[PDB]
Design a protein around this ligand. Structure first.
Ligand SMILES: CC(C)c1ccc2oc3nc(N)c(-c4nnn[nH]4)cc3c(=O)c2c1
Length: 609
């Protein structure tokens, strides 16, 4: 409960403690405006210090916390610093939440990388060495437009250190972005870099120079490597493709072949300056995100789709808002239509495509031990709540996929019907032409060319008539009740009416409440006898919520998703066969449309002076 000239803070409002100064929740005394006070009790060693802090006062930027003033505590004469209060916490705080247990959401990851790189660029423009970049050293405030604003705070932890040290600037940034991407750290021995400290350094130094992750699965065991994000990471493959190279080449200890800052700020800005176009491969039931600059063309856009789904350019037939897209190779990306996850561009290819659907990592979940270990129960509750939160994220993605298939199929049928009606238009164009050449030849009536041409027109109507029978049978399929009807799609799956996502999130909210309370029990050390009781019963309720939610996820979701997906393969096959027939019959209405007139403009018109 110390005080100062201005400002004042309570001692129970301690938010962070560490080397030298702690950080409290202070006020302004004259006003009730909140502040963050750095106490600085250990004023060891040594004018120059107040000057190297006076420069920190003037420096103003969106991605840094601001030092407002320095003051002297009343009773102890300790150098206290007032700073911008960040009510949301730090980047490590949001990485503690089970929603980010397997990685930040895609949009908020862009907010992190934007604000982090922008803040470090502004610091290097003034020459402020940070080096020790950490999620704890990255705070979060809410912007005036909601959103989020991340700000650096401490400049001028062993887990985020370069190999040359660990007892060189871009190493910490790579480990933080990987931690933010997948919700887990890279380079991990067996259960933290604790006693396996010598194991950790063996992982950090001597790296395949192209990988990003290292992890052993057993005690004193082997280390697996990978140059890609894991399957569990909830980040679009359209973003991992251009995010892997920057990580794999800044985490290389060889300073000869490591990105400088100018190249780091160049590749990162390239990522941030792009826009996203949502594309759902209907034939494969896979959603995608194309990260493409606003000045690029549609040709490179089709190439980026080929890089994800292996669909050949110019064979990619695009659907949007129930209509075909018919894009041009010169149109800029900033002129494309809007794209959301719930309104993505659908993609067919007229070729047989392997339907794979969504690929997610099975977890199988952890066990709860009857041991009363509080810190063990806290760390266990954090992992298991992130697991069921992963199942909710997968369940919402599988529901989106099913509903998007229903929309893309419902449009695709109404698109085939339009092409079917266009073929009928060209059919009657040949019919009326065939009628006006038959009744004209039969009106005028050696004479061998008369019967020859007449029987040739009889051959035209004979093939044209069987084309009509084949078309009306095709419509009999497109008609309700027959094949290719989008009737099964309204069944066999899950719908927002079933509210499976909400049935899982109510148990997820009960879990995260128990987990938040278990983390409070960690700070309280020993608990009261009654609080020990409720900690035990809620510990068992965590297992009951897990068994009930996970069973509802595997028996309602997934299982019905597999049935809807297995039947989607059948309808896709029958749809490709339908479009192959209707296209061939449409071509048959074009060559015989040229066979007439040829047998009308000529051969019926003779000459005479
Ligand atoms: C949820 C808890 C853990 C919380 C909430 C708000 C916070 O708000 C902060 N605002 C600051 N300006 C600084 C700071 N660190 N170094 N300099 N200022 C630290 C914090 C917190 O730790 C914090 C924690």
């Amino acid at each position: 409960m110390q005080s100062t000239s201005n400002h004042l803070w309570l001692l129970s409002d301690i938010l962070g403690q560490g080397a030298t100064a702690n950080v409290f929740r202070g006020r302004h005394k004259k006003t009730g405006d909140l502040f963050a006070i750095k106490v600085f009790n250990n004023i060891s060693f040594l004018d120059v210090q107040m000057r190297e802090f006076e420069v920190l006062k003037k420096l103003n930027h969106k991605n840094i916390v601001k030092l407002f003033a320095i003051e002297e505590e009343t009773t102890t004469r300790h150098k206290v610093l007032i700073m911008e209060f960040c009510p949301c916490g730090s980047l490590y705080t949001v990485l503690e939440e089970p929603s980010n247990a397997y990685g930040l959401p895609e949009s908020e990851f862009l907010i992190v990388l934007r604000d982090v790189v922008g803040g470090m660029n502004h610091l290097r423009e003034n020459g402020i060495v940070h080096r020790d970049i950490k999620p704890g050293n990255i705070m979060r405030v809410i912007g005036e437009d909601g959103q989020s604003v991340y700000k650096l705070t401490d400049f001028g932890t062993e887990e985020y250190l370069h190999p040359d040290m660990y007892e060189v600037d871009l190493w910490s940034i790579g480990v933080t972005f990987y931690h933010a991407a997948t919700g887990s750290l890279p380079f991990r021995p067996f259960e933290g870099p604790r006693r396996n400290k010598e194991v950790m350094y063996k992982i950090i130094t001597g790296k395949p120079s192209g990988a990003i992750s290292g992890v052993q699965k057993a005690e004193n065991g082997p280390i697996d490597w990978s140059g890609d994000m894991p399957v569990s990471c909830s980040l679009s493959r359209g973003l991992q493709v251009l995010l892997t190279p920057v990580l794999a080449n800044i985490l290389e200890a060889d300073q000869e072949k490591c990105w400088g800052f100018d190249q780091f700020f160049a590749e990162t800005s390239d990522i941030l300056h792009r826009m996203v176009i949502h594309v759902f491969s209907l034939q494969q039931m896979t959603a995608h995100k194309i990260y493409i600059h606003s000045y690029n063309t549609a040709t490179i856009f089709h190439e980026l789709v080929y890089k994800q789904t292996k669909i050949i350019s110019s064979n990619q037939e695009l659907i949007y808002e129930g209509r075909r897209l018919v894009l041009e190779p010169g149109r800029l990306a900033q002129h494309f239509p809007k794209t959301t996850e719930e309104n993505p561009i659908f993609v067919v290819s007229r070729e047989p495509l392997n339907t794979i659907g969504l690929i997610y990592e099975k977890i199988s979940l952890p066990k709860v031990h009857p041991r009363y270990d509080l810190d063990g129960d806290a760390s266990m509750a954090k992992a298991i709540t992130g697991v069921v939160c992963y199942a909710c994220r997968i369940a919402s993605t599988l529901l989106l996929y099913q509903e998007l298939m229903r929309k893309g199929i419902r449009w695709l049928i109404e698109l085939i019907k339009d092409d079917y009606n266009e073929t009928v238009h060209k059919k009657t164009e040949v019919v009326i032409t065939l009628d006006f050449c038959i009744r004209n030849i039969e009106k005028t009536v050696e004479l061998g060319e008369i019967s020859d041409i007449h029987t040739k027109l009889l051959r035209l109507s004979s093939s044209q008539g069987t084309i009509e029978t084949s078309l009306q049978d095709i419509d009999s399929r497109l008609s309700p009740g027959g094949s290719l009807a989008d009737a099964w799609a309204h069944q066999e799956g899950t719908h927002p009416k079933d509210r499976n996502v909400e049935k899982l999130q109510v148990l997820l909210n009960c879990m995260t409440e128990i987990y938040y309370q278990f983390k409070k029990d960690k700070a309280e050390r020993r608990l009261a006898y009654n609080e020990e009781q409720i900690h035990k019963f809620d510990k068992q309720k965590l297992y009951y919520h897990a068994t009930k939610a996970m069973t509802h996820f595997t028996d309602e979701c997934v299982k019905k998703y597999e049935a809807f997906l297995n039947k989607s393969e059948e309808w896709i096959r029958k749809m490709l066969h339908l479009r192959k027939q209707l296209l061939s019959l449409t071509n048959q209405c074009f060559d015989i449309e040229e066979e007439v007139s040829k047998y009308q403009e000529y051969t019926n018109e003779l000459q005479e002076t």
